[PDB]
Amino acid sequence: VRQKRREKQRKQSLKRVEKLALYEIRKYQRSTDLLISKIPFARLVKEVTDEFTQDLRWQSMAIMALQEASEAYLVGLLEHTNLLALHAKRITIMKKDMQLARRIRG
Amino acid sequence: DNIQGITKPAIRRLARRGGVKRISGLIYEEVRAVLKSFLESVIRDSVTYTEHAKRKTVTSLDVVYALKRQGRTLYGFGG
Amino acid sequence: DNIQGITKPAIRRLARRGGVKRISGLIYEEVRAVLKSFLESVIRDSVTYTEHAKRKTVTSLDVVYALKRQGRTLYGFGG
Amino acid sequence: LALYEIRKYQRSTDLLISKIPFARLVKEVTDEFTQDLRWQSMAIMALQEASEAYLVGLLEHTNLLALHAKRITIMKKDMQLARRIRG
Amino acid sequence: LRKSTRVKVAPLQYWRNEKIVY
Amino acid sequence: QSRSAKAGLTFPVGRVHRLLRRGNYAQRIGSGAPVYLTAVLEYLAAEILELAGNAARDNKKTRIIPRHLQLAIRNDDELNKLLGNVTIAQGGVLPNIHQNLLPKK
Amino acid sequence: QSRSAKAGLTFPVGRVHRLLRRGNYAQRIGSGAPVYLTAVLEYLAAEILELAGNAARDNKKTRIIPRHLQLAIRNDDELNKLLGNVTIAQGGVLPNIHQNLL
Amino acid sequence: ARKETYSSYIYKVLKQTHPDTGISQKSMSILNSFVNDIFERIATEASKLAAYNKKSTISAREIQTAVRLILPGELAKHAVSEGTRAVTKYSSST
Amino acid sequence: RKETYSSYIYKVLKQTHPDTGISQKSMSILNSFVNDIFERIATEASKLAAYNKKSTISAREIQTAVRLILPGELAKHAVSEGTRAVTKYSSST
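^ Those are the sequences you sent over. The predicted structure of the assembly is below.
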């Protein structure tokens, strides 16, 4: 159980060392990794594939590429709706703002 | 339910990645609905690829080919 | 001088054809600007097509293939 | 008389914009890019149709963008953000 | 010779709801 | 009977087989693929022709104008999602008027 | 003597000519074709590696990460014309807060 | 000299569906461009799918998957119905 | 065992900027990008070949395709690099 001892040592190291909303915009714009929790998204795409299926398997890198592409499409639609939101003199976005960009793209 | 697995602070952090100051409470359900729609629209082609190929593994090659067919192509997982 | 080949009531009637009723005065000049930036890529692609055809007259099939490459496929002028 | 021209130009499914000034304009842009080139009239009316479709798509996109910002008269910024969802 | 019709009930009004399932 | 009419269809099979034979699309070709192309394109043609006849009946005419083709394609949902990004010469956009511009209704 | 050593080429011009031959694209491929394909791929590769080297230089990291390649591909209008639709895996997005919120 | 078109077959299937309707030549050229365009779409997608399945032939399976890809699902199942009808009425080679 | 450009990418990286390291995922992203632009120029060259009665893909077809896809500065530098390499190839056999 040397891997378990190394994991407990790394967890202890993270617990000891590693452990006005304007900061989060510039904070999460320089982040590179994913931002959606992994295994609920895997359960969700398993439920989506149950509509169009048979015990269809799943490689892990395929679900990783799906999570990356879905996060990219969502931040693309959100970055495009922010401009239409501020264009209508709304700092706070609304569901009407994510209707025209969902309409005029297709 | 698995459609509510992407919770409220997840979409909050996504919006902070996309640069929003304040967000409303009506955003999250439409975000989840358009996410389910995009996932269905890519997964139908990604599983017809693996159903033609006499396979049951949805391979990364199949999802990058389905992404290249629908415009939004990824790099690094084939092609 | 051919930069003013289109006129202001023509853009006004095109706005009535679409549904735009109230028009600003800058809209006609911005429409001329976006027409300038819109035709240039497809027309220079047709010049590249005619250079591939090594002639002087631009044929219609080269125009149809250029609009097909740009993503603006037109039906009725070839095939 | 607001609904008169909307039910007139839309139901008439023919063109509305000019031809020979557009021929002068395409001669101008070929003088800008190329050497004179002879131009088939079918290609000129195809460019006319494509420009008409692009313009009516841009105006039908800015139509809801006008009412989105509590406006009716479209603005110069409306032909600055409709291009963001057109490439 | 003869072709049968199908479901033509909508222009697929989307972007605030979901689509139909076959 | 020839291969263009052995299956009791309308579109020619030898035409599309000659187009793929010189179009360089594969090394070989299966026998069911040109008649499958025949069936798919004739069903698409018959569906858009039925919709074109319905559009010509909607405007009480007999012949087909590009307005009838626009009413055939852009009114149907699947033809809109299939032929949305294609322009049509002298077609005509759909008649639709927004309600806020009308001061009465 | 390979076809790459006849022009100082590095990208596999014989392999590229083989994939053009047995690749369901066309019938004949001229001898002047795959050296030119190797040339344009070498120019594109040199451009993107020089941009990645600059992105590694100004960000004090001696290696190439997909964030550096994403900032390479997204901060150039010619690269936004070429590949403005595709994305990079784990590349992130462009940090640009809009002026109206500021 | 000729140009390959399908106006005769389009007019034949149109008079077979409804003999009391006509069609002009501009719409005929539009529909000929349309059928050449969708033939190009299905053929290039089938070539892509055959090159992706490690198989350099074109059977009806790749065409079935390709019309399941780009056509909508109601038209996809109607297309596989018409395709199976075409193969089953063509297989009787007597 | 797949025909990968990876050693060639490291080779052409070591000529102009050898001080930068290269990871695995970034190298695979580079390989997928160069394969994507390769198949794009391949189908565009095949399309332009099948357009106007020239089944042989010469330098003319692919230079028209390079001028077709790329922007003006990129097509200018690409046609310069291509003319340089085709003179260096046709001169030294």
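The radius of gyration of chain D is 17 Å. DSSP finds four helices and no strands in chain D.

Shout if you want it in another format.
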